Amino acid sequence: GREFGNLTRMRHVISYSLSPFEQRAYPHVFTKGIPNVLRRIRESFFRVVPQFVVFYLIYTWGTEEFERSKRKNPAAYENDK
Amino acid sequence: SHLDGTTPVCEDIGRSLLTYGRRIPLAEWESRIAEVDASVVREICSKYIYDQCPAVAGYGPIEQLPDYNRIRSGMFWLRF
């Protein structure tokens, strides 16, 4: 079960391969590669991105509220007189 | 030993003519064999075998056959 000699029992399968020296290292990396990457990105965009956008909104508001708190209070001095 | 009998000789005649056009006599083979030397064998084998790209084919319970990169790496020595 841990040696290539005996791992599983398969039947009726064929495989075809070519030598590394008989083929290009970057085949269709301009017409077929980029579109596949775009498919990958698009297929998982809405599953991740939006949550991290919420994080950014929480981060900005926080900082804004923190600084907003340190501003002096005109309502604590109107009557101080 | 292959040429014993009349069938092997006629087959040799027919096959040899189609390729060479002439029946190369046996005495000519021995002359060419004598030219063979250890230096000659090494040069020719290095010419046609060393660091080449083999073709492979396996029909069997073959899960342990090394991948093509393992075989291609075994086509040459690093000690050499």
Side-chain angles (χ1 to χ4, degrees):
Chain A
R2 293 176 65 181
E3 319 308 302
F4 267 109
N6 50 357
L7 300 175
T8 187
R9 182 179 173 66
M10 290 192 288
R11 215 166 72 192
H12 310 326
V13 176
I14 307 172
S15 179
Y16 308 87
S17 296
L18 269 170
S19 168
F21 303 103
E22 302 287 345
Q23 51 189 347
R24 291 302 300 179
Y26 297 88
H28 285 340
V29 71
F30 40 87
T31 188
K32 198 186 180 187
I34 295 92
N36 196 61
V37 178
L38 269 74
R39 182 209 45 95
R40 296 171 59 182
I41 300 169
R42 152 63 171 159
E43 173 164 319
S44 70
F45 186 92
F46 275 7
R47 299 179 147 122
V48 172
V49 172
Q51 317 186 12
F52 290 94
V53 184
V54 174
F55 162 90
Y56 177 77
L57 296 162
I58 295 156
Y59 166 90
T60 48
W61 188 85
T63 308
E64 205 190 61
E65 198 275 0
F66 181 39
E67 180 179 299
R68 172 191 308 124
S69 87
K70 275 150 283 163
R71 305 287 73 110
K72 64 204 303 185
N73 295 0
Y77 315 147
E78 52 174 58
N79 299 357
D80 205 350
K81 185 64 178 185
Chain B
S1 162
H2 178 242
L3 280 291
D4 182 67
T6 302
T7 287
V9 295
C10 65
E11 188 276 337
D12 206 35
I13 291 165
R15 192 178 23 75
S16 189
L17 277 182
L18 291 180
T19 70
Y20 312 114
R22 61 203 200 71
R23 179 76 188 297
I24 172 162
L26 260 181
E28 206 195 307
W29 288 110
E30 196 282 342
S31 69
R32 292 186 189 255
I33 288 170
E35 319 186 342
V36 177
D37 186 4
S39 177
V40 176
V41 160
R42 288 186 290 102
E43 291 176 352
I44 289 170
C45 291
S46 178
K47 185 170 179 289
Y48 288 97
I49 288 177
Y50 188 84
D51 193 4
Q52 294 298 102
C53 292
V56 179
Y59 183 31
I62 285 160
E63 180 174 51
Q64 189 173 352
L65 179 68
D67 212 353
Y68 190 93
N69 290 299
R70 306 286 290 167
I71 295 165
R72 181 63 177 81
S73 297
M75 273 293 109
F76 65 88
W77 275 352
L78 297 173
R79 57 173 65 87
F80 170 78

